[PDB]
Design a protein around this ligand. Structure first.
Ligand SMILES: CC[C@@H]1[C@@H]2[C@H](C(=O)N1Cc1ccc3c(c1)OCO3)[C@H](c1ccc(C(=N)N)cc1)N1CCC[C@@H]21
Ligand SMILES: [Ca+2]
Length: 223
């Protein structure tokens, strides 16, 4: 997260760290046995880490749970990043509490100007790599489709939206991928891609989760 603020420990209880010996992606807990992340975060050997603040220190409230399966959207396209979403099933159900909790799926898509909360443990600088220990937070609005498509002509599908600041200086970045964009208490986005981080006129692009709710529900029901 570039230009954000320290969330505070366990203030974002649905936030997850995907770990393979190191943090590589975020995710969101959507019930006690399933996580939503980005398709481009796919790998084998994923451990899900719940209840984290400092990812480098065991502080209490952590639960480490292996992924038993990862389900990349079958129409995910690695070139265009269309359908950049993946479901992860936990080996065992998480123990839900004040500090470990699920986030609701949306019943409707969010409109432009909706202010959202984006969080993660990714890079906090644009040019240069500085990773935080603790979870960072950023408040950012959803941009209009017209502004999104003028920023990234020809690259924006109906399954994507832009959020952030055209003036720059505030954005998600490397390591934030697959993390949550939560607006009015519902999961509306997944950190997917962008052009650098926090560059002027290059806002972040996010998977539009409201387009996948039935897929999510049908997939979880059958697995
Ligand atoms: C694996 C994808 C990679 C991903 C994300 C991204 O931007 N990519 C580049 C990419 C790939 C294909 C594309 C694309 C961008 O635009 C159209 O098609 C991602 C990324 C980069 C920048 C932001 C951001 N500024 N909000 C958000 C996510 N990077 C960081 C680490 C993983 C890598
Ligand atoms: Ca920790």
């Amino acid at each position: 997260i570039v230009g954000g603020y320290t969330c505070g420990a366990n203030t974002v209880p649905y936030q997850v760290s995907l770990n393979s010996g190191y943090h590589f992606c975020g995710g969101s807990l959507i019930n006690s046995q399933w996580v939503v992340s980005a398709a481009h975060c796919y790998k084998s050997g994923i451990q899900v880490r719940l209840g984290e603040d400092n990812i480098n220190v065991v502080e209490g409230n952590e639960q480490f749970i292996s992924a038993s399966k990862s389900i990349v959207h079958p129409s995910y396209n690695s070139n265009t990043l269309n359908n950049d979403i993946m479901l992860i099933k936990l080996k065992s159900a998480a123990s839900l509490n004040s500090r470990v909790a699920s986030i609701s799926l949306p019943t409707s898509c969010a409109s432009a100007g909706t202010q959202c909360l984006i969080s993660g443990w990714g890079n906090t600088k644009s040019s240069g790599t500085s990773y935080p220990d603790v979870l960072k937070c950023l408040k950012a609005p959803i941009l209009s489709d017209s502004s999104c498509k003028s920023a990234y002509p020809g690259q924006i599908t109906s399954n994507m939206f832009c959020a952030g600041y055209l003036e720059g200086g505030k954005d998600s970045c490397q390591g934030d991928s697959g993390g949550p964009v939560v607006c009015s208490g519902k999961l509306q986005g997944i950190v997917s891609w962008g052009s650098g981080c926090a560059q002027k006129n290059k806002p972040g692009v996010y998977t539009k989760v409201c387009n996948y709710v039935s897929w999510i529900k049908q997939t979880i029901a059958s697995n």
